[PDB]
Design a protein around this ligand. Sequence first.
Ligand SMILES: [Cl-]
Length: 261
Amino acid sequence: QIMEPHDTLSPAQVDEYRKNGFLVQEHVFDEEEIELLRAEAAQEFASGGERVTVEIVRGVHGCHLYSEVFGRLVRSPRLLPIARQLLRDDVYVHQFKINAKRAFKGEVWEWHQDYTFWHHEDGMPAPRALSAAIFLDEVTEFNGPLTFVPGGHGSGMIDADVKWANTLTASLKYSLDVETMRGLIERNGMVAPKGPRGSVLWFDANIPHSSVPNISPFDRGLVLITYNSVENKTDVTRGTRPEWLAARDFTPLTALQATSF
Ligand SMILES: [Cl-]
């Protein structure tokens, strides 16, 4: 039994990722694969307990530690080789979350950089990390797409006002002020990457992003896997969050092979 040989990004794709801070690959996973992930996401929403965020289940953290399916997903030959390529290291999962934005539902998600949280909360020493967002549904203009400042990762951590942090909370602990964002957006603009179901959106730990409610009759499910460089492992002595928000096992991930079961 055979896995398709590892596909990595072209130089042009790598260059685009480093310049813009994000990159979409369309149609990575097929409809049947996505349906398996959707069904498992529903199970995690139902069984997640303290790991679930509710408005009314909004999201769940840490599923790769509790779900065999999601544990295998993070080792997928469609994902792991590219994470290794972009971070130029062995990698592990720092954080796993599923963000469901149901038809005609959702709230405004304030501008933020993930790295600000991971640095201050978890002791991540540098922004040598990224997220892979798997599109469980087509992402459009109207179902609350992740919206970015292209190139906005390239001036490092932007000063935020501090208020366990959680980027799925209503009020973010570290949000970006109007003056800071104005300047960044005036220089760089805004982009909401679109794509079909089964696409993967790769984005930098330090890219500013935000989103709006879903005004479509269609759901917008995202599965977000945050890969971190093993060299860039967090300082567990500075971190206090549970394992399902910030991983403590820095064992390098290996790729899934094709077996008889
Ligand atoms: Cl976080």
